[PDB]
């Protein structure tokens, strides 16, 4: 019985990850697929609540601890992810382990190797879309929030980390020109996604970074 695809959307802030993740699930379902949306962090769980308070600057959390909470927040959803994929449901995920590594890896004294480890073994995405946008016109997309990491210097360091992760050819990375209209970007993403659902799925679900 045909498994669903695990599709992740990544990108710096204001690239369009959440808008395109919502539109993608809508379109896939309208075209007869079974598809559902997930996002990380998943702020509804106990761990998710700690992460939400940290990101809102309502609480401070030691940098290594918070990194591990972001990873645990993904692991607590692994039984659900595997169940849905095995049932033939494609999952569209707004941020995943790559944001986990890029954001902590932007802090001083955090190696990419250490940042990756907690997430080693997670379900491996069949397609990782990276929504590219000059940090500049991304900045044309309204302005910064009061949330953690919402500043230019930090975003640039995270962006450097994302390009280090893209050197990883064990992963099906696809660059998306997120500077176009919402509808144009959506169509690029939708076509890539239909190909992965069909093809990428002929092989068993993989394990990330192993």
Ligand X SMILES: Nc1ncnc2c1ncn2[C@@H]1O[C@H](COP(=O)(O)OP(=O)(O)NP(=O)(O)O)[C@@H](O)[C@H]1O
Kindly list the residues in this chain that would bind ligand TMP in the complex (CB under 6 A): 40-41, 55, 70, 95, 99-100, 103, 149
* CA dist., res. 37 & res. 173, Å (int): 19
The one among 4, 16, 100, 118 contacting ligand X by CB under 6 A: 16
Q: Which of 15, 20, 10, 8 is nearest to 135 (CA)?
A: 15
Residue 109's alpha-carbon distances to 65, 79, 157, in angstroms, are 14, 33, 13
The one among 19, 45, 52, 53 contacting ligand X by CB under 6 A: 19
Within 13 Å of residue 150, how many CA atoms lie on the same side as its CB? 13
Helix (H) or strand (E) holding 94: strand 90-94
Residue 99 interacting partner from a second copy, Mg ion, ligand TMP, none (CB closer than 5 to 8 Å by kind):
ligand TMP
Report which DSSP code applies to 173. E
Helix (H) or strand (E) holding 43: none
Q: Is 14 annotated as a binding residue?
A: yes
Which C-beta is closer to ligand TMP: that of 53 or that of 194? 53
Nearest approach, Cβ of 198 to ligand TMP (angstroms)? 28
Which C-beta is closer to ligand TMP: that of 3 or that of 74? 74
Map the footprint of Mg ion across residues 7-26, applying CB under 5 A. Answer: 17-18
Which C-beta is closer to ligand X: that of 48 or that of 85? 48
Strand 6-10 vs strand 127-132: parallel, antiparallel, or unpaired?
A: parallel
Q: Is 49 annotated as a binding residue?
A: no
Give the ranges where 38-174 is alpha helix by DSSP (H).
46-55, 63-75, 78-86, 97-105, 112-116, 135-138, 152-165
Q: Is 23 annotated as a binding residue?
A: no
Q: Is 58 annotated as a binding residue?
A: no
Q: Is 140 annotated as a binding residue?
A: no
Nearest approach, Cβ of 62 to a second copy (angstroms)? 5
Q: List residues near ligand X by CB under 6 A.
A: 11, 13-19, 141-142, 181-182, 185
């Amino acid at each position: 019985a045909r498994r669903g695809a695990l599709i992740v959307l990544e990108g710096v802030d204001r690239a369009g990850k959440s808008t395109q993740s919502r539109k993608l699930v809508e379109a896939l379902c309208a075209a007869g697929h079974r598809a559902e949306l997930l996002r990380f962090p998943e702020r509804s769980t106990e761990i998710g609540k700690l992460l939400s308070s940290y990101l809102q600057k309502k609480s401070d959390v030691e940098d290594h601890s918070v990194h591990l909470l972001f990873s645990a927040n993904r692991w607590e959803q692994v039984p659900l992810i595997k169940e849905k994929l095995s049932q033939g449901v494609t999952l569209v995920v707004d941020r995943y382990a790559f944001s986990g590594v890029a954001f902590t890896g932007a802090k001083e004294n955090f190696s990419l190797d250490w940042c990756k480890q907690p997430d080693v073994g997670l379900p491996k995405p069949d397609l990782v879309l990276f929504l590219q946008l000059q940090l500049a016109d991304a900045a044309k997309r309204g302005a910064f929030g009061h949330e953690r990491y919402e500043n230019g210097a930090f975003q640039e360091r995270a962006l450097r980390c994302f390009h280090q992760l893209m050197k990883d050819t064990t992963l099906n990375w696809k660059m998306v020109d997120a500077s176009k209209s919402i509808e144009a970007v959506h169509e690029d993403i939708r076509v890539l996604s239909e190909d992965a659902i069909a093809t990428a799925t002929e092989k068993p679900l993989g394990e990330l970074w192993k």
